[PDB]
Amino acid sequence: MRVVVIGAGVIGLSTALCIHERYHSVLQPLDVKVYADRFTPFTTTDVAAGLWQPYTSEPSNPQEANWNQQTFNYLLSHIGSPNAANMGLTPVSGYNLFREAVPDPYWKDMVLGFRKLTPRELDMFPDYRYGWFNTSLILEGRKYLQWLTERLTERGVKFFLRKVESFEEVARGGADVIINCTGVWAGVLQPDPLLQPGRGQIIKVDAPWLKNFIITHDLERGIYNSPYIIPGLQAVTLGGTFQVGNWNEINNIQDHNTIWEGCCRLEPTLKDAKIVGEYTGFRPVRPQVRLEREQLRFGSSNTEVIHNYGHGGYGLTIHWGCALEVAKLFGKVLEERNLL
Amino acid sequence: MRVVVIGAGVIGLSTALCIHERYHSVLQPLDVKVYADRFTPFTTTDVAAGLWQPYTSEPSNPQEANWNQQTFNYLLSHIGSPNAANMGLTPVSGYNLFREAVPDPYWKDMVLGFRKLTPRELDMFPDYRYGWFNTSLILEGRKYLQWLTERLTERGVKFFLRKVESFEEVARGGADVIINCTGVWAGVLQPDPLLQPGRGQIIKVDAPWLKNFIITHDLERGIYNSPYIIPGLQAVTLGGTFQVGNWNEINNIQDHNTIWEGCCRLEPTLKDAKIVGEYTGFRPVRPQVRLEREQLRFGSSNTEVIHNYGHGGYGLTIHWGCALEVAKLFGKVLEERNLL
């Protein structure tokens, strides 16, 4: 049939690929089209630090924990292939430093070799007295998106540069099903008082010698409002801010300083690092991910809509699990229409 | 007095700086000259992989077990300094993969977070059934030599490009003490059957996405006759050859393929790595490191000679603990000769 996906970030292209991948063989014309106002370099996904790591706190809707676990194994299974890196995927080991002892996270068994830090190791970070170590995966937002768009292109999925004004618009257009993957920018399509922006800023730097990631935590100031250093495919992401309710899209020198001096006390060799860029992004902060089916009708119309947005600061980390879900709900639409 | 150090590799320059730091403030005129027929870019130390790791096999002269540990505490103690990376030092984590279980190494507790690989992680390396994981350090020999030469230069230590034909030649040159740090070429100045070269070849590639080190072991081929991938400051080192008794300084086309094919089977993503260099060096293969005193009376002369060579594949790994040793034997001399 005719499927339209609004959104070209990790969640949108991920959901698309997954859908076409599992139903193209049964559906006659399966017309999948992606609409989005901004693409690749300009999505929230490219500004991502590119690390697999759910929050240190448990989620409401434990259904999100299984989605994180799914993504990990999907990505881990490519850690074999010769094209893993072209996808923006690669293994990394690192630390999560704390000022006081905290309980283990619920994902301690999802990652590789998680263990508490020994005394010697903490002497490398005098400012912290507690912490963990483990190996995870790197999913460079920028590169992963190019790969996803390429995989789709070959499958016949078409890309349109357009800012959808409302569902009806796409509906009239002729979409039988609509996949809403518009991140923090939802609301504009349908009001959602629960979906707010979580402004984050990062500095891109050239420190090829930094091979391990380091995330620090200030349990008083909130998650990611503490300096972190995350190496990527060929640049290191320096970060430290998470401001809720802030729609300011411009780099703030006020934050520039916090991140830089915060990261330079943590890793003094950064004084030689060369800044390659500074970007700002809005995490789709929502008390819970919205992933459900909704029936919107317009007289003789009756269009189908499936949502999948509001993944806060764990979009890359949970993307695939969420995608499998949508595909599953998409399967129940065909069933309801007698399509198998 | 006059101390003449023969050898400008990691063992010579280190011993040089160690002697200076400890006795400079006491001996009236402390002359220190370093002679070498080949410098930095061209020493065996510049061809090193850079990993801090002794052989898996138990040692001989448990004396080496402590020189290794000293050297590690020396290097680790630089991880907080802003000059760590400019010395060629940075932390790395990695794997040691085997085809069958083997006893733990004696240095297991010398490094950080040592542990055995689990089933999941093994599925990442299909050809191996056992392994360890631990964090260590990179001591890029290249950077380290330039770093030491600068530190020595600001200290008054003069360098001389001169090939030493005999110890006598130097004892007559006007030198009271001699530190023999001539590497695999020591025998040329005093026959030594126990010493032989351990030729090895290595491929320098550009694969910045590789963050961890991978070392495979083929128990039936000896040591480092299995591939290994060691990420460096800004280039990655491919390797896997150990040929004792071979003195060819040129690259063997076959050895190139044993390394390349083997590392690609281990790490598929290499197919897109752009080779940057290939080198060949000879490890100072000796059943035991030779660090000892040897008076050499040359008619009235009487020069003291201290030997520090034959470190095979663990020169960088054990350098500092040896220099600390030369400095003490030198203390003795200083005392007997009664300059203190």
Ligand SMILES: Cc1cc2nc3c(=O)[nH]c(=O)nc-3n(C[C@H](O)[C@H](O)[C@H](O)COP(=O)(O)OP(=O)(O)OC[C@H]3O[C@@H](n4cnc5c(N)ncnc54)[C@H](O)[C@@H]3O)c2cc1C
């Ligand atoms: C600084 C920073 C670092 C981060 N680091 C990490 C990390 O390490 N790991 C992690 O998992 N997560 C991280 N995140 C969060 C992660 O980036 C997000 O969860 C993820 O990008 C959300 O994906 P998305 O689908 O919302 O897509 P987005 O890319 O945000 O948006 C997809 C598309 O929606 C389109 N769109 C929106 N409105 C409309 C409209 N009206 N019409 C048409 N198209 C529209 C956009 O044009 C866009 O292309 C980070 C976030 C920030 C800000």
Ligand SMILES: Cc1cc2nc3c(=O)[nH]c(=O)nc-3n(C[C@H](O)[C@H](O)[C@H](O)COP(=O)(O)OP(=O)(O)OC[C@H]3O[C@@H](n4cnc5c(N)ncnc54)[C@H](O)[C@@H]3O)c2cc1C
């Ligand atoms: C491929 C490869 C990889 C390696 N990887 C590692 C690793 O990861 N970790 C590790 O710890 N070790 C490694 N090693 C071993 C390490 O490189 C050696 O143990 C170390 O370089 C030995 O130092 P050296 O003191 O012998 O110095 P070298 O640099 O070999 O020699 C020092 C000096 O001796 C001078 N010299 C010799 N004879 C004379 C003479 N007659 N007159 C004047 N000057 C003379 C030379 O000119 C030179 O400047 C590796 C070796 C190889 C070949």
